[PDB]
């Protein structure tokens, strides 16, 4: 389990980082979108009602 470094002798580093970077951005946006969509976790609305702004 301490030989995972050998994955870099198989996959090209230039391709893994691009594949990983695209995936992490779209995963972060996807989860942030779900939280905003649900009114229970929409933090912009939570503060709006907490401080009686609208």
């Amino acid at each position: 389990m301490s030989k995972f470094y050998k994955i870099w002798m198989i996959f090209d580093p230039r391709r893994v980082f691009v594949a990983q970077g695209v995936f992490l951005f779209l995963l972060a946006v996807m989860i942030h979108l779900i939280l905003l969509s649900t009114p229970s976790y929409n933090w912009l609305e939570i503060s709006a009602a907490k401080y009686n702004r609208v």
Partner: protein, 43 residues
């Protein structure tokens, strides 16, 4: 010796840099979840 023309010592160094950035990204994420969970738990 490989599929990508990378020597074993080159792979040893590259993986060590990668896992360093992965612990850093993971540790910051754990703080984010821990702060959000205390603020407003989802369970």
């Amino acid at each position: 010796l490989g599929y990508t023309g990378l020597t074993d010592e080159q792979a040893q160094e590259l993986h060590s840099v990668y896992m360093s950035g992965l612990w850093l990204f993971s540790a910051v994420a754990i703080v984010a979840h821990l702060a959000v969970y205390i603020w407003r738990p989802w369970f």
